[PDB]
């Protein structure tokens with residue numbers, strides 16, 4: 001009846017037996033695509049191009065043709081799999097484009113010395129053309145999507161200190177896939193470049209758009225609404241950024257990763273500006289004093305090399321006496337299950353680990369390499385990293401963290417360089433490198 | 446009367462704290478689908494929580510008709526969880542599972558050679574295995590042993606990062622011989638049949654080891670007495686300290702499962718969230 005008309009009109013041909021049966025269900029979504037006014041869409045994309053991609057040399061004729069060609073691609077596609085892909089991708093545009101992209105067209109200086117000192121003690125180790133335009137579009141995107149997109153990284157600190165040379169704009173969103181598909185289409189229609197959207201297995205809910213030559217355009221991490229709700233954040237220049245206080249904690253955790261320490265030696269000043277900004281932020285916002293008083297930080301960290309579990313003595317600061325930090329996330333997951341614990345607190349890529357307090361013992365996982373100063377001895381850089389990881393949870397659940405953070409920061413002062421004897425390897429993360437190839441009508445996960 | 450006040454329901458077998466000798470002397474439309482929907486939503490949400498579900502391929506063997514799977518599929522889809530569903534059964538699935546790019550329906554009886562073939566095809570995708578294979582009325586112990594040998598083969602070949610396996614220990618009086626199953630927690634099932642001793646063996650694999658553990662006749666005795674106690678005594682209780690529209694134990698048990706489920710819609714309390722979820726599920730399965 002009508003469903004047949006729907007499919008026939010969509011396919012621009014009489015639906016074969018095979019096709020009618022397979023597409024029968026998508027009838028409703030298909031109808032939505034058909035009714036969608038393509039001319040208005042062609043107009044919106046062009047309007048977007050004059051605002052963010054003015055320097056892209058392609059005619060209105062070329063843009064219109066790419067768009068109209070795609071909205072009729074089904075008429076020349078017979079492979080049922082490809083048809084499902086085309087229906088899915090067209091649906092994303094039809095239902096979300098105007099809401100996501102369419103709307104787009106309608107005291108550090110004094111802390112630099114402190115930062116240099118801290119970082120010096122730690123220095124003991126050893127991208128396509130479109131980015132410019134994409135970043136500019138993102139500056140706007142962030143202001144128009146406060147509720148579903150927040151920023152972290154150098155750009156967010158750049159909003160606090162204009163002297164920061166940010167490479168890109170790091171974001172966490174509640175609708176990453178939708179955003180990335182819409183943006184991939186926008187870029188495709190305007191530039192004609194066959195971009196590819198891919199998913200990386202060793203990162204959590206992470207997707208990235210790369211150009212035809214495999215150059216990086218932009219990426220995004222997806223997080224649930226509850227995670228978005230609890231992530232510490234600050235409102236600046238009409239956008240939300242992750243609280244610089246929380247970002248400082250992650251920076252400390254980050255240097256436990258051997259790779260990052262190697263980056264430090266390569267460009268010390270890059271990190272100095274970033275650290276100096278956060279140090280000042282915390283100094284002024286929380287009244288933290290850098291008197292060099294260590295107190296009970298960093299907490300004692302003992303590693304069991306055979307079981308890849310670092311025990312952190314937390315009794316001096318928290319209600320739980322110790323925290324068992326697993327280096328293998330699958331082992332942590334299995335052990336928690338064996339404890340009959342069903343409500344471990346998860347924060348996705350924000351912490352890259354669950355946190356469970358059970359019988360006054362915290363259980364969590366550390367996603368970075370653990371640095372050792374001696375055989376079976378955890379390097380102070382990693383002890384701080386582990387302490388920082390535990391404080392993320394404190395901040396995410398509105399617990400006490402101020403004093404501990406102050407002591408941690410102060411413990412980084414007046415330190416001698418300590419060479420790295422060795423380090424643990426991160427656990428293996430299984431999984432396929434998934435991707436969406438619009439040009440090829442392929443989606444594989 | 447037949448009332449009780451509880452801190453929480455028994456979520457796993459190991460938590461049942463009493464027994465009762467089985468007595469041979471011993472309700473909702475689509476209750477079977479409800480039972481499966483709840484257990485799989487619980488299992489899969491747990492894997493979501495611990496970062497295991499993200500990007501996985503859920504391979505379900507013995508999934509027909511699988512009506513409830515469509516709810517599971519839409520649920521995670523709406524949460525933006527990237528998953529590939531592969532539903533395999535010797536019989537056909539409910540048509541509401543057709544026409545979905547992200548779910549592959551396979552009508553075929555599985556054997557070792559077919560298992561090796563899909564593994565090679567899926568590799569290096571992270572695999573989550575859910576098995577509900579069955580062999581009628583009350584299979585024989587020999588048939589159950591055969592089913593469990595198959596589930597073990599499934600695991601050895603697929604090398605899943607996690608699995609949910611149908612688990613019902615052969616009755617003591619019909620014992621044949623000891624056998625092995627993977628190490629895992631034994632999840633109890635609300636809305637399971639009145640005197641069902643069936644549970645869900647949930648495993649999260651570490652290293653490349655199934656950690657097979659032995660099941661003895663002595664274990665069979667314990668399973669029978671523990672589950673009979675649960676079914677005869679516990680599940681027939683009204684939980685008076687459970688402030689909910691329905692206070693029967695199974696609803697109390699369902700509540701502790703649904704409270705662990707994620708939803709992007711925001712609610713005032715956990716009760717409001719569970720009530721919404723329960724409503725959504727009953728509506729989907731056509732249960733008043």
Ligand SMILES: Nc1ncnc2c1ncn2[C@@H]1O[C@H](COP(=O)(O)OP(=O)(O)OP(=O)(O)O)C[C@H]1O
Pocket residue numbers: 153154155165166167168170247248250251253254255257260274368
């Ligand atoms: N391995 C890690 N462990 C913990 N946190 C990390 C790790 N890697 C990155 N982060 C978090 O994200 C921040 C860095 O993202 P990143 O883009 O690599 O630095 P950046 O300052 O933005 O450098 P660019 O300006 O983009 O060149 C620092 C920290 O808050």
Ligand SMILES: [Ca+2]
Pocket residue numbers: 153154155167168169170
């Ligand atoms: Ca960055």
Ligand SMILES: [Ca+2]
Pocket residue numbers: 168169170219
């Ligand atoms: Ca980035």
